[PDB]
Amino acid sequence: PHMTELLFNKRLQVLVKSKDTDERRSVIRVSIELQLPSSPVHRKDLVVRLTDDTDLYFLYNLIISEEDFQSLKVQQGLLIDFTSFPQKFIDLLEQCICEQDKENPRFLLQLSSSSSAFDHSPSNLNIVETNAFKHLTHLSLKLLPGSDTDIKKYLASC
């Protein structure tokens, strides 16, 4: 059946932006869980969910299976394996938290769609290190906007 372990649940400052809007700084709830996988031969899936305490219409989520992580690892050149990924992801988020209330945060969290804010499309969750020369992306995740089923299901657990 569907069981989950909660690894991380915090509200973070997030720079939300689309290909047409301006960078809005919002307080977003970032939830990270491990769930039993579809297949007994796989490790637990990582579940990332973003919500807004002031907007029940706002929902983004992503399920990262062991296999999904392999593609991620290759595409971004990650040097760890799936087993340590959740903690490293969390460690990065904690650095964003440590820096969020500073004049010029060295680390910040972005939610950026390459499309219009008017579009029901994927948004990239980016953990970015700020630099005078050029910003460095430590991790990029492709989050999907919640479907009608996902939102109903989520709200039904609230």
UniProtKB/Swiss-Prot annotation:
Q: Which residue range or ranges hold the PISA domain?
A: 41-93
Q: Which residues form the signal peptide?
A: none
Q: Where in the cell is it found?
A: Cytoplasm, Cytoskeleton, Microtubule organizing center, Centrosome
Give the highest taxon in the source lineage.
Eukaryota
Record note on quaternary structure: Nine homodimers form a cartwheel structure with an internal diameter of 23 nM and radial spokes connecting to the microtubule triplets.
Function, as annotated, reads: Central scaffolding component of the centrioles ensuring their 9-fold symmetry. Required for centrosome biogenesis and duplication: required both for mother-centriole-dependent centriole duplication and deuterosome-dependent centriole amplification in multiciliated cells.
Q: What is known of its domains?
A: The 35 nM long coiled-coil domain mediates homodimerization while the globular N-terminus links the dimers at an angle of 40 degrees to form the inner ring.
What protein name does the entry list?
A: Spindle assembly abnormal protein 6 homolog
The species this protein belongs to is: Danio rerio (Zebrafish)
In terms of the parent sequence, the fragment covers: 1 to 156 of 627
